[PDB]
Structures are given as C-alpha cells and as structure tokens.
Symmetry: C3
Subunit: 406 residues, 3 copies
C-alpha cells in the first residue's frame, strides 16, 4: 500500500499531459475528472467533524498555559516562513526574468472580531474553521475546568460531552484511513484533469513562470523547512517520507482545509504529534499560512509588471507584495484564490482592467495556468504547516521520537 499515492500522481500527470497534447482533454473532463472530485468531497466531508472533535479533545488534554505557548510558537513560525517566502518570491522571479514578451503597457480589526463566532452552530454549518477552532478551544478548556470540580454530576456531564467529541474524532480518523485506501485513484484523476487542461499551456514565457514559481516553492521547502527542522533536531528526509501523503494530497486538492483530515492523520500516525498540539496548530495554519501567497504574488506580479513594461523597483515590489499579504491573511486555502487577489492588487493601484487592455491580457495569461500554480502553492503550504507543527510539538515535548528512527 505504501508509496501508491506517488505512483498515482506521476501516472496521472503523464496521462493528463498526453491526453491534452492530443486534443482529448474534453473527454477527460467528462470521464476522468469525477473520480478526483469524489476524492475531494470525501475528504471535505470530514473537515468539520474531525476539526471540532479533535480540537475539543486536544484543548481538554492540555493546560491553558501550554495552549497559549503553542499558539505563540506556531505564529512566530508562520511569520518567519512567510518572510522567507517573500524573499524567495522576489529572488526567483527576478532570476528567471519572467515576462520577456512585449505589449503596449485597513479592515483587519473586523477580521479579528470575526474570529469569535456569534453562533457556533452557524459557524459549523457554514464551515468557518477559525471560529470553530475558537469554540472548540474554549469548550475544551471549560470541560477540563469542570472535570476538576468536586461535584461528581458536573464531572460526569463534562466527561460524557468530551467522550462524544472523542468518539466523533476517532470515527473521522478511521474514515480518513479508509478513504486513504482510495487516495491513489483520486490523485490520479485530479492531476490528470489539470495536466490535460492547463499543462499543455506551460510553454514559452509561461513555462519560465511556472518553473520560476515552482523553483521558489522548492527553495522554501529545501531551505527554510529543512534548516528549521535540523536546528531543532528533526531528520528532514524522514520528515518528508512521513509527510508524503499530506504533501501529495495538498498538491492535487489545492485546498489546505480539504487536506486537513489527511494532514491530521499523518500527524498522528506518522509524525507522532499529540492531539493537543496538532488539533490546534494544523487547522490554524491551514488558514493563516502565507508562504504560497507571498510566492505567488511575488512571481506573478513581476511577470505582469514586465509584460506591460511598467518599471518596478525591488522595494516597490516588496511593498506591493506585503500589502497583498496583509490583505490575504485569514483566508484559508481555496482554488482560484491568488488570481482573485492579484486582480484586486492590480485594481487598487489604478491600472485599467477594461477588456482589451494590456493588463487584462497578462492577467488572463496567468489565470490560464493558475491551477498549475495553485497545486504547488497548496503543497508548499501544507508542507510548512506540518513542519511547524512538528517543531512546536518538539519544543513542547509533545513529539514521539520513536516514529523518527529506522
């Protein structure tokens, strides 16, 4: 069973390219794509149950103090890694010199308030991850306070509620395992459709864009995550071997949230992270991780700027990327995200997006490879989420070391 998913990925990508190159991507859309859509839905089904129950259990299992420390540690991690992602975006974008073709040429306060759900049942029904995180944490904390109270009735009620959440989480993890028996087929179908539709379009300048973007992701992995793991004494090759199922699922599904059941099962079975850490850190990182955004914006912004011949200094590119990143924070992984955010960035600087204009043209070109860019963006984000979770668990002594030894 082991390694079957990576075969699924490679075979799907080859089939997709061949089918697209020979004209048949339309038939693929009809016949192949539904198996991958099914894989994606099966994983989505589990997100709210597993996230709620796992975080209620985790926040019960852990002291408020330690939970606060885990929060601050993981946020510092995500800041570090997003800073690196901005750097590598600027660097690799300029090295590849993307866009050598020729044309003519603050609301964050309410986002924080919105962290607190006004109706937790509504946030569950609407699939809002961050407020569910908040309610689960507060419920877990309250539950442990009640379970230390003297009156036995209170203790027994709290234990029953906690067991209901524990049972739900357990059932979800089991279902994830079952779905992961299916995962290779889904991965094949998704990468096949993407390759058949947009792979053939990666050529000429856009190939250098895709290469540039993927180079940036590669560096973010092999430099930032590996060095951070080594500094804290984790073998990065063992890490990758254990992360592989989460990484490939992130790649193909293009959703940090949709991979969560898989990422959490990998953190439990493979990484050996305690639920008190990953049940909190992973859903949070799925919504706050800004590495892929910084990389996408840096590269695609440079490509666009060069396509219309607008001069852009390194500092000006940096300020633009940073303001785009600030506008992006809090948004979870969703397909077609960075393209929309890029369109917003272009609009806000006063550029003419009316049909026929050069900028509308460069944007459409990016938009047509956007799926190819999103796969890598999501894969590097989920990778960084697992890395930071493992690191924090280690610093909190919640990492099981036996899993990391051949």
């Amino acid at each position: 069973v082991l390694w079957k998913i990576l075969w699924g990925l490679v075979l799907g990508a080859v089939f997709g390219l061949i089918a697209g190159h020979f004209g048949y991507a339309g038939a693929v859309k009809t016949y192949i794509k539904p198996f991958g859509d099914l894989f994606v839905r099966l994983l989505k089904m589990l997100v709210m149950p597993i996230v709620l129950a796992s975080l209620v259990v985790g926040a019960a299992s852990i002291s408020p103090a330690r939970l606060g420390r885990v929060g601050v540690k993981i946020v510092v991690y995500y800041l570090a890694t997003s800073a690196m992602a901005v750097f590598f975006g600027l660097i690799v974008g300029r090295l590849f010199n993307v866009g050598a073709n020729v044309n003519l040429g603050p609301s964050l306060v309410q986002t924080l308030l919105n962290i607190v759900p006004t109706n937790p049942f509504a946030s569950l029904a609407k699939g809002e991850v961050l407020p569910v995180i908040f309610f689960a944490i507060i419920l877990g904390i309250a539950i442990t306070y009640l379970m230390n109270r003297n009156e036995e009735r209170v203790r027994k009620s709290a234990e029953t509620l906690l067991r209901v959440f524990d049972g739900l989480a357990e059932a979800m993890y089991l279902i994830v395992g079952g779905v992961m028996q299916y995962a290779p087929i889904g991965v094949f179908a998704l990468i096949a459709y993407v390759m058949a539709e947009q792979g053939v379009r990666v050529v000429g300048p856009l190939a250098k864009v895709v290469g540039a973007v993927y180079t940036g992701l590669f560096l973010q992995i092999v430099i930032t995550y590996f060095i951070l793991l080594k500094v804290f004494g984790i073998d990065p090759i063992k890490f990758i071997r254990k992360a592989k199922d989460a990484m490939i699922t992130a790649f193909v599904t293009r959703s940090s949230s949709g991979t969560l059941p898989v990422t959490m099962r990998v953190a439990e079975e493979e990484m050996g992270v305690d639920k008190g850490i990953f049940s909190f850190t992973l859903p949070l990182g799925a919504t706050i991780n800004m590495d892929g955004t910084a990389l996408y914006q840096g590269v695609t912004v440079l490509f666009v700027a060069n396509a219309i011949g607008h001069p852009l200094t390194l500092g000006q590119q940096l300020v633009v990327v940073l303001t785009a990143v600030l506008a992006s924070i809090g948004t979870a992984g969703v397909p077609g995200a960075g393209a929309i955010m890029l369109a917003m960035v272009l609009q806000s600087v006063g550029l003419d997006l009316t049909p026929g204009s050069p900028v509308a043209l460069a944007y459409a070109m990016i938009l047509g490879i956007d799926a190819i860019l999103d796969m890598g963006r999501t894969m590097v984000n989920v990778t960084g989420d697992l890395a930071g979770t493992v690191i924090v668990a280690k610093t909190e002594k919640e990492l099981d070391e036996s899993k990391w030894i051949s």
Copy 2:
C-alpha cells in the same frame, strides 16, 4: 384510537367539498387550514433528528456486507416498481382518453457527486436527506469498527456517541407517537382545505383526468405491490391495515420526507422491521421512488398532448416519460413538483409557453388540480416505500413475523 385517522380523512374531504361548493373555501383558508399546517410542521420537525439518529444506529447495528445487500435489493425494487408505474401511466391515460376538449394546437454525474456531503453539519442544517444518509451510514460503520477495537477508551467513546444518537432517535419516535395522538385533526384540516379549494374543480374532462390518474395509482397498489408481497409471502391485507397511518399521512401531507417519522414509526411498531433495514431504506426511498412521477407525467402529458391536438405515438410518449423520469430522480417528495417538471418537459421540446398559447392554457388547467394529483402521488409513493422495505427486510430475515398474524 385505532382507525381515527381514516375518519378524519373522510370527514375532512366531505366538509371540504361542501364548503367549496357553497363558496366558503376562502373562510376555510383562514380558519381551517392552519391546523393541518401545524400537523405538517410538527412532523417536519422530526425528520432530520429521527433520520440521522435512526440511520447511525441502524448502520451500527448491521454489517457493511448486509447493508450493501439491502441497498442493492431496495434499488432493484424501486426500478421494478417505476417500470410498472410507467406502464400503468400510459395504459390508463389512453383508456380514459383524457383531453377531449379542443384548442388551436445529461447532468446526473454531479447529482451523484452531490450524494457525498462536503459539510455534514451544513447538510443537517439545510435538511438534505441523501447526504445525511451517507454520513450516518459511514458514521455507524466507523462506530462499529471502533467498538470492536481492543482499546477500551475507543470503545467507550464510540458507545457514548452511539448512545447519544440512540437517545435522540428514541425521543423522536416517542414524539411521533404523541403527534399521532393529534393526527386525525391535522388530516381533517388538510384534506378539507384541498377539497374546498380544488375538489370543486374536478369535473368534466378534468374529472376524467383525476379519475384516470387515481386509477393508475390504484392499479400500482393493488397489482404491483400486492403481487410482490404475495410472491415473498406477506399478507397484503394485513400490510395495508398496518400501513394505513403512513398511507393517509402521505396522502394529506403531500411529502414523502414529511411523512418519514410516521412511516418509520409504522415500520417499527406495526410492520416489525429492524432499524438496520428501514432506517436506511425508507429515507432513501423517500428521495428515489419514481412511481408517482411516472404516473403523473404519463397521464398529464397525454392530457396536454390531446388538448393541443399534437400527435403522440405510444413510443414517443414512452421516451418522453422516461426522459422526464431521468430528470426527476433524486428529488424528494415536495408539493408542486410534478407541475414544475411537466413545465420543464414542455419547454425542452420547443413548445410556446408564452401567455395566451394553447399549451400555457392546458398547463394552467393541470396546475389547478395539481394538489389533487399530488395527494395520490405521495400516497402511492409512501405505500411503495413501505412495501419494498418490508420485502427487503424479509429477504434479509430482519422482519418480525408475529406482527403479521391475527
């Protein structure tokens, strides 16, 4: 208490006809109808709790293999009965020669993917039955797998979750029983309003339409269901006696889903079907049963075709009905359904529905008796659902025979 509902039905229907015939149906709308609306809402309240909890419990109570066999058996049953419904629709429509008045004259793939909920809390809040069925089944299965695991903590969590669902289901069935103390009043009020508004309109050609339609339903009952029950060794007269509360409730409420709490209580208390069978088969059949649709479309399509003098061969009528049935699958029982589907069918063949046209006129005439047709459609559908559930339970040895013996 027993048989009180059937008195409610007959008395309500008489009162409704008299009130309508004498002009007073408007007063009925004001004063009488709310008691029936209340009955309908009280039953609706129970659908999601009882369906979720009953199916979680049932799928826990039964092995995956047996559950698969129950699924395939009940689907084969619904195919058989829909084929018969098409036949009887064509036959009875032509025998009555409906419409002797004179005027001038594929997206199923996404429906299957949509079977899988992406947010089960969302599907519960939105009242989507089929995805709730899916999640409950998978949860039940997962729960039983965990309850056979060695670790006691896992077993105890799973048992607590399963008991929560069992308690909810039990509470729902008790509430159903209480509501069924009220049922005769609700049945009276509903049939009274319907008779007062549209009963008086069943005369002349439309009476032959109503007669024709009701004849088709009658045959579907007394031929298809009775013969199928006898082949498998169930007394059909005992069956009807036990089904009577579900049949009348289906008749008056015009909703397969809204009758579900009653249909399930009848299957438990009267039919003696195990929850492992009916908690699955009945909610599924409420959304996939196509007998009433085939009958409605066959008759009303023939009536319309004759009204505008458009020649329609038996094979052409069959192909039209079949494509309407394919378009209808997956839609649960809802008032005003077949009228909309008929309107779609008329539009798709290129007919002119603009005001004043002959087809708009014939459609309005059907629309005005549509409630009268819907009552029968829903009653025959719920009857067929109970019949197929009982049959499958028998073939699985999950039917308690002591209930069927005087």
Copy 3:
C-alpha cells in the same frame, strides 16, 4: 470584583460624552469601540448552546403540568407589564410635551405556526430562539418519559443525551463567568462609543424626549416591578442588587438575546432560580417582552405627531400604540428595532415619507438618538424578564430564599 461593572458604565459614559463634545468621537469609533464589540460577540457565542442545553435540562427536570403552569404564569406577567408600559408611555410623553418645535406638518397566524421549527438543526444554525425553545422542551419531556420507561437501554440512551446537554450548559455557564471577569472593559467601551456619537445630540427638544423616555422606563421599574415583587414577598432592593450585572449588560449590549447567558447566570448564581423555571421563562421573555416597545412607540409617536402638528387624541394614540405592539410581538431584542417599527407605523397610516417631507425629518431626528433610546429599552426589558422569572419561580416554590437575605 463585585460592583466593577457599574464603575465601567459610569466611567465609559463620562469618557464618551467628553470625547464626543470635543470632536474626537471618530477616533473613538476606530480605537475604543472594538473592545465592546468583542464583549458583545463573546456573549452572543453562548446564546444557542446555553439556551438549548439549559432548556433541555430544565424541561427534563420538570413535569409537563408544571411547565404548562410556568408558561401561563409568565405570559400573564408579560401582558400585565406591557399594559403598564403603554400607560406610562402615554402619560410621560404627554407630561414632557415632547416636540414643541415647528414644521410644515393580520399576519399573526403564520407567526404562531412558525413557532414550530421545521428543521431544528436549521433553527440552531440560524439562531432562532423560539423554535429552539420548542424543540428543547419537547426533547426534555420526551427524555424524561423515556427515563421512566422500564427498559434499561432506553433509560441509558436518554441519560447519555441529557448528560451531553447538561455538560454543554455547564461549560457555557463557566465561560459566562470567565467573560464576566472581562465585562467592565466591554461595558466601558460600548457606553463610551454610544455617548461619543449620540450623547452630544441629546439637547433641546430631544433632551426632553430622552428624559421623557427614560422617565417612563424608570417608572416601569420602580412601580410595576417593585410593586409586583413586594406583593409576592421579594425584597426589591435585594432584587436590584442581584440583577445589576444583567441590567447593565442589557443596557450596553442593546440585545435581550445577547444578554441571555448573563441573565441566566445571574438567575442561577444570584437569584437562585431553578433551571426548570429560568431556562424556559428567560429565553421566552427575551422574545415576547413588549414593555420597551410600548414605551418607545408611545413617546416617539407623540414627539413625531407634535412635530408635524397632526392632532392626536389619547384614544387614537392608544390604538396606534396597540397596533404597533401587536405588529412587534415575537421579535427579540435587536438594535435599531423600534426605529424600523416606527417607520412602518408612519407608512401604514398614509403619511408621506418622501425626502424633504416633515415626517421624514422628525423620523431622522429620532433615528439619531435611537441608540440612546435603545439602551434604556433593553435594560428595562431584561429587568422585567428577571422580575417575572423570579416571581413565577416563587409561585412554583422553585425560588431559593437563602439568596435573598443579608
């Protein structure tokens, strides 16, 4: 810790007036207001969990007969107090002679049906209090019926479900306590923003309107509630001392529903009311209490009538207020409510609300102090809710007397 909230209120109100008087209310909107919005959201988070679980537990704890008696007692109470509120509205409005400036110059049946939820999960997700009350009551009743049944499996399932709801309620009350450690800051921020924006606008005629309105509220408290408490043998000064946290929270949040977790914790910890009483009476009173509405409409209607010089007899004012009250019943406490209802009342009598008209002008003037009027409206409503809850609990012998004795 005790009395800290009342300091928060007074200090916030002073800061707000000074900031507004000196121009800086805009900065307040940016910097100060979010802390109060956070307080409001933190309380809102708890409404559905605590209301559901508390009412399931309460209706389990109490017999159906006693629950019916509690219902009828509390409704009679709310009728009495709304009649008094109408009286005091007319009286105080006329005494202050509001509006001495000079210009040119039934659907209740469906509301009752809507009490019954058609999908209780939907009503939880949508935050509909009254249908959640209904489902919780019926669930509690059903649960106690099952727990008296002979079969132990049924008893154990019902007990598990009831314990899940009890644990949730307990966790909510604990969280409320924690939030109430924070309450003074929130109260400060809210009253500060309101004073800075609209306090400065209370001058001249509008000051007499505000005074008039607040006088009416004062009377409703010191006459109706005090006399009713004394008749039944409750010390009204002890009552106020115990109610103070609920009263101030109601004042600042301007939401009966949003204060519910606080009102219920006050009823439990301070008043000593059994959950069987207050878990039902308080959420119901939050949606049906009509005292503030009668007062608001009486005063603002008189002010408007005098501003445009339209002659209004005392009986005509009474009929208008009564029809507005009938239109208002069932609506829970929400900011900006009475202004909308007043606008409806003005429209329905045929007045010209087109821009520039005198009535549009008087309405805009009320609208600009509407927040100042809403604070008092909500505070008097929550006060009356606690008073009636305590009274009913006493008549049912569910009030703990030890809490009322120094």
